Amino acid sequence: QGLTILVKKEIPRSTLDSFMQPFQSTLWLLVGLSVHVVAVMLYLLDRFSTLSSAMWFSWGVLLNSGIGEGAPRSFSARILGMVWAGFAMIIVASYTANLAAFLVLDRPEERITGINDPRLRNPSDKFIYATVKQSSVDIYFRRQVELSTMYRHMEKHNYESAAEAIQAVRDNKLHAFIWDSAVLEFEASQKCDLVTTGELFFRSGFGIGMRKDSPWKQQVSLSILKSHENGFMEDLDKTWVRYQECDSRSNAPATLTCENMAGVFMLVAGGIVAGIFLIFIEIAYK
Amino acid sequence: FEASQKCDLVTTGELFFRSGFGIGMRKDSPWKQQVSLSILKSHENGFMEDLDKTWVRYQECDSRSNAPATLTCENMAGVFMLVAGGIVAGIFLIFIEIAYK
Amino acid sequence: ICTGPNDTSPGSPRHTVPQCCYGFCIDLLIKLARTMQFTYEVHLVADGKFGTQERVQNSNKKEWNGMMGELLSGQADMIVAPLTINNERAQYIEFSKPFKY
Amino acid sequence: LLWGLVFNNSVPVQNPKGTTSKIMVSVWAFFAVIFLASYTANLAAFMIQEEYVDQVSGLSDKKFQRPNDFSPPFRFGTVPNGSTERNIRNNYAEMHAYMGKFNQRGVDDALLSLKTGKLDAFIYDAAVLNYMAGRDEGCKLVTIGSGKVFASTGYGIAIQKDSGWKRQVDLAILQLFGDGEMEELEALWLTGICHNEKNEVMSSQLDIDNMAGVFYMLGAAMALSLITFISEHLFYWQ
Amino acid sequence: WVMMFVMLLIVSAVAVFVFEYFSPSFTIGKAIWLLWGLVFNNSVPVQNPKGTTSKIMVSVWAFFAVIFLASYTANLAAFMIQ
Amino acid sequence: EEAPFVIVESVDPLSGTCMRNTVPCQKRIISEEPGYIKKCCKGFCIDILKKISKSVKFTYDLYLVTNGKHGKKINGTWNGMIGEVVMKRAYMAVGSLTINEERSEVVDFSVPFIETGISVMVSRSNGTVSPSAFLEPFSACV
Numbered sequence: 018q019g020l021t022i023l024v025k026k027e028i029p030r031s032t033l034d035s036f037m038q039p040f041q042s043t044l045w046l047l048v049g050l051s052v053h054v055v056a057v058m059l060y061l062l063d064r065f066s067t068l069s070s071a072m073w074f075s076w077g078v079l080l081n082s083g084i085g086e087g088a089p090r091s092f093s094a095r096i097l098g099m100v101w102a103g104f105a106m107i108i109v110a111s112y113t114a115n116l117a118a119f120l121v122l123d124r125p126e127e128r129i130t131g132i133n134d135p136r137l138r139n140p141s142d143k144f145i146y147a148t149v150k151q152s153s154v155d156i157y158f159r160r161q162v163e164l165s166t167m168y169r170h171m172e173k174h175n176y177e178s179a180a181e182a183i184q185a186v187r188d189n190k191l192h193a194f195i196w197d198s199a200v201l202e203f204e205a206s207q208k209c210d211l212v213t214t215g216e217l218f219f220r221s222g223f224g225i226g227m228r229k230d231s232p233w234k235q236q237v238s239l240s241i242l243k244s245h246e247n248g249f250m251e252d253l254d255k256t257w258v259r260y261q262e263c264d265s266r267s268n269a270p271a272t273l274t275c276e277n278m279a280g281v282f283m284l285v286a287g288g289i290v291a292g293i294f295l296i297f298i299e300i301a302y303k
Numbered sequence: 304f305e306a307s308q309k310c311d312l313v314t315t316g317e318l319f320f321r322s323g324f325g326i327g328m329r330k331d332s333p334w335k336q337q338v339s340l341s342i343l344k345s346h347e348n349g350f351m352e353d354l355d356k357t358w359v360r361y362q363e364c365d366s367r368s369n370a371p372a373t374l375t376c377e378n379m380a381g382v383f384m385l386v387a388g389g390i391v392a393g394i395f396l397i398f399i400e401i402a403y404k
Numbered sequence: 405i406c407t408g409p410n411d412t413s414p415g416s417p418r419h420t421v422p423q424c425c426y427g428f429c430i431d432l433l434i435k436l437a438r439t440m441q442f443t444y445e446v447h448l449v450a451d452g453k454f455g456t457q458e459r460v461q462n463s464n465k466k467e468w469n470g471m472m473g474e475l476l477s478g479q480a481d482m483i484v485a486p487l488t489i490n491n492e493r494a495q496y497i498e499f500s501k502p503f504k505y
Numbered sequence: 506l507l508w509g510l511v512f513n514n515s516v517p518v519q520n521p522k523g524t525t526s527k528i529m530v531s532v533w534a535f536f537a538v539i540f541l542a543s544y545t546a547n548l549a550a551f552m553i554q555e556e557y558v559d560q561v562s563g564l565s566d567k568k569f570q571r572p573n574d575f576s577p578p579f580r581f582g583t584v585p586n587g588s589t590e591r592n593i594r595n596n597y598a599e600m601h602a603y604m605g606k607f608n609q610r611g612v613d614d615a616l617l618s619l620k621t622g623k624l625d626a627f628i629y630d631a632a633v634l635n636y637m638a639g640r641d642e643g644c645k646l647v648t649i650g651s652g653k654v655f656a657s658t659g660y661g662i663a664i665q666k667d668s669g670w671k672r673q674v675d676l677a678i679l680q681l682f683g684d685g686e687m688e689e690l691e692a693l694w695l696t697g698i699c700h701n702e703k704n705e706v707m708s709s710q711l712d713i714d715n716m717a718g719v720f721y722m723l724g725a726a727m728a729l730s731l732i733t734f735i736s737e738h739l740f741y742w743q
Numbered sequence: 744w745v746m747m748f749v750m751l752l753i754v755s756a757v758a759v760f761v762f763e764y765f766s767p768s769f770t771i772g773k774a775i776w777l778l779w780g781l782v783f784n785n786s787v788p789v790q791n792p793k794g795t796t797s798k799i800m801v802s803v804w805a806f807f808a809v810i811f812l813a814s815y816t817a818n819l820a821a822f823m824i825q
Numbered sequence: 826e827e828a829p830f831v832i833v834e835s836v837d838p839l840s841g842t843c844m845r846n847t848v849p850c851q852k853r854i855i856s857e858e859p860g861y862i863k864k865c866c867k868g869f870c871i872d873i874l875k876k877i878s879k880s881v882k883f884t885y886d887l888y889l890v891t892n893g894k895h896g897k898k899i900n901g902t903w904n905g906m907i908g909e910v911v912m913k914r915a916y917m918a919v920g921s922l923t924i925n926e927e928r929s930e931v932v933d934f935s936v937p938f939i940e941t942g943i944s945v946m947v948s949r950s951n952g953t954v955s956p957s958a959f960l961e962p963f964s965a966c967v
């Protein structure tokens with residue numbers, strides 16, 4: 018028997034607030050200026066050796082639509098147009114590359130690794146972890162001399178039970194819980210949503226006790242050795258503590274979802290409703 | 304020093320084995336006390352720092368971290384080799400098509 | 405200006421010849437001489453080893469060859485060099501305060 | 506046409522009606538898609554931004570004695586009444602007069618004002634730092650390399666003026682060093698842990714106009730256009 | 744994976760009438776084809792709605808398309824890490 | 826008493842002794858003049874003191890300080906541990922005691938066992954991309 022740390026297995030969930038996130042809220046204001054600049058510049062440098070034409074030409078070649086027909090005929094305009102196409106490709110490439118660089122590095126925080134975690138050795142109010150008040154572990158940590166600050170931390174959050182600890186762990190009011198190996202492994206395999214981790218640092222074995230002079234100790238030890246040999250103890254193990262078997266492999270990366278990038282089709286619906294207003298004005302004008 | 308000199312090798316690690324250098328004499332020189340006093344004076348008034356700056360930490364080829372690699376002239380050379388092969392195959396292609404047509 | 409060992413005189417493995425001897429440790433030496441009034445004559449003589457406790461041809465087995473030899477057996481009276489601090493060496497020698505970690 | 510191919514479908518363009526040219530443009534397009542994919546991949550490889558430039562520095566550096574020489578100057582201070590005060594006020598002192606605006610009411614205040622950008626460098630004892638820098642929680646802050654220290658002395662222990670018995674404790678301590686126990690004792694009391702885990706990696710959420718260069722090159726072509734616009738006179742005088 | 748399909752048809756119907764009022768016929772038939780070509784990748788010669796306002800609708804659709812495709816390829820490069 | 830070297834907390838609540846502190850250190854006080862309390866005094870310098878007194882055979886009894894912080898000169902008089910040693914009211918000074926010139930001229934000193942001095946501290950800045958990144962992913966060949 019040793020000791021281990023029980024934590025809640027955080028289900029993966031991507032943190033992407035909006036599609037606009039990978040750019041500053043000021044680049045978007047610069048691209049429009051640039052496109053209209055190139056538009057009017059094209060309109061000028063053609064017939065000096067159609068406005069809507071060149072305007073749509075730019076707005077298309079950036080937006081990668083197919084709509085539009087205007088082909089610059091001057092020798093001036095062609096160069097500017099081609100380099101503008103270049104600029105367009107490079108903007109979109111930068112955008113997608115940055116977004117991928119943001120998503121790759123969004124694997125959730127790694128869980129604690131045993132007892133030598135910086136996240137555990139240097140306590141903070143950002144990561145709360147405690148154990149049962151007045152138990153053998155709080156005793157073992159009072160008695161400990163290598164580290165005491167952790168003790169200080171776990172002095173303020175101790176729960177006076179086991180069930181309350183388990184609950185608060187399922188309710189995220191407590192990020193970690195230190196305890197015995199046997200109880201924890203079973204409690205994890207049972208509920209199938211919490212996970213143990215660490216390595217058994219404190220070590221011991223359980224045993225059966227008698228007075229110092231019973232006439233029986235020798236036969237008892239012999240019987241227990243027989244049991245360990247002929248597989249009986251293994252069968253009891255299999256039957257009683259390692260049975261339920263909710264084991265699994267590692268996790269998968271997160272999946273952006275119904276609200277993760279919800280803003281974009283909200284935008285397109287707003288585009289439809291704006292078009293509703295656009296048709297009415299244009300027809301009367303024309 | 305050997306690193307700051309040639310500027311293409313780098314040191315690393317942390318000083319595990321520890322000690323200090325020192326000046327030695329017999330066990331009964333009449334001088335040890337004045338020598339230790341002089342060395343402390345030197346450590347205080349910056350003299351030792353100046354010798355340091357002059358003799359071992361001078362050349363100063365330090366730099367920041369590195370940048371990721373850059374695929375280059377031969378890294379992806381095969382593709383335009385392919386396109387040139389396409390041109391030479393087209394040379395073969397035009398001759399046959401015209402005669403056929 | 406300090407005299408030299410054999411191999412600095414390449415002809416014979418025995419004779420010696422002066423050389424220009426020059427470094428910052430020498431600068432510390434000169435500083436000391438200025439503040440601790442004395443003259444000096446430096447000689448770069450050894451076999452080429454600092455000379456920790458070696459063995460013998462099985463006669464006495466306590467030698468302190470090399471630089472410690474020159475210090476203990478009356479050859480010299482001071483050692484200015486990158487000499488470490490080692491409690492073995494602290495048995496027979498007297499060290500100054502540390503001046504470089 | 507080929508420019509439109511390689512970069513991105515831009516505009517109505519004529520297509521070579523030949524029965525074999527189409528082959529040439531097709532393989533060109535193959536080259537194009539491979540090219541663009543490779544490019545965007547490697548650029549996503551660049552934008553990864555290792556964490557610690559760490560801003561190395563010396564000790565008798567112009568980065569200190571000439572603060573106003575730089576873009577907005579350093580904000581580096583000390584604790585006033587202590588010892589290091591006097592230890593510097595007797596070698597340069599012109600730094601000293603400059604650093605008066607940055608006193609710190611203690612130590613924890615100094616670290617706090619260090620995390621939140623109010624300061625950018627701290628100058629103080631060596632050992633107190635090398636203890637503190639290895640204890641605080643995030644430890645996104647680190648001392649400079651322990652090879653460039655200004656006035657290197659040592660915590661030791663005292664004894665009566667006459668040699669009662671000094672050489673005894675002297676050899677004892679040197680034996681302690683030689684056997685390798687100071688290291689263990691430090692590891693048990695002094696160092697702490699987060700000295701390793703050198704540098705993380707971060708995303709940085711590209712928002713700066715670092716594409717300024719990009720923009721600039723755009724503008725460049727604009728000017729070239731006007732240069733070639735000059736051709737409108739190189740017909741008028743023709 | 745289904746909103747876009749619904750967000751596809753709903754837009755297309757708006758074409759069949761927004762075109763009808765302003766000024767080879769962009770019916771529901773060709774229109775669906777067009778938007779599919781938009782979202783995934785430029786495929787083939789397709790008719791373009793000659794209206795002075797539909798073009799606005801297809802344009803914003805194209806904006807949606809480029810953002811969509813970029814997001815998709817990014818997250819897939821996120822998956823393939825093993 | 827100092828933060829990371831020499832700690833001073835209390836006696837044990839059950840028996841008043843110490844568990845592994847191993848030193849009573851006789852926390853005297855003047856407020857005649859008695860030595861009031863004996864509190865446990867653990868830390869780092871205390872550890873090295875124990876480790877060394879093991880080898881060189883002697884015994885000891887730590888003695889707290891009352892006059893000054895560490896030691897300074899006032900009217901040609903030494904106030905602090907250095908005072909406590911310059912007159913033989915004790916025999917050895919332990920703890921966070923720095924070596925300088927004038928002290929080493931009045932008192933003696935062992936070999937230093939912790940190196941120290943004046944140093945600096947930075948904040949480990951973040952670091953952004955080059956403004957000329959866009960052109961990075963292809964050498965001048967391609």
Ligand SMILES: *[C@@H]1O[C@H](CO)[C@@H](O[C@@H]2O[C@H](CO)[C@@H](O)[C@H](O)[C@H]2NC(C)=O)[C@H](O)[C@H]1NC(C)=O
Pocket residue numbers: 707708709950951
């Ligand atoms: C360096 O580290 C990160 C880079 O991602 C920045 O962190 C956030 O910074 C703000 C400060 O405005 C904090 O309130 C947040 O808690 C930090 N984390 C997150 C997840 O937002 C940090 O600001 C960067 N340093 C500077 C000077 O910008």
Ligand SMILES: N[C@@H](Cc1cc(-c2ccc(Cl)cc2Cl)cc(CP(=O)(O)O)c1O)C(=O)O
Pocket residue numbers: 584586587588589590630633827828829895921922923924
């Ligand atoms: N020990 C030094 C005195 C001395 C001690 C400290 C100090 C303070 C808190 C802690 Cl926890 C540890 C230490 Cl070492 C700091 C300084 C520096 P300053 O006083 O300028 O603030 C100092 O001088 C001596 O022997 O004179």
Ligand SMILES: O=C(Nc1ccccc1)N[C@H]1C[C@H](C(=O)O)Nc2cc(Cl)cc(Cl)c21
Pocket residue numbers: 149150151152153154196197199200
């Ligand atoms: O902590 C306690 N009791 C306690 C309960 C509530 C409050 C305070 C203390 N018991 C520990 C140690 C206990 C023993 O005899 O060593 N047996 C034992 C066996 C298992 Cl399986 C797990 C543990 Cl933690 C324990």
Ligand SMILES: *[C@@H]1O[C@H](CO)[C@@H](O)[C@H](O)[C@H]1NC(C)=O
Pocket residue numbers: 585586
């Ligand atoms: C430190 O020096 C300042 C100088 O103004 C003084 O006001 C203060 O009393 C001194 N002591 C402390 C503990 O700050």
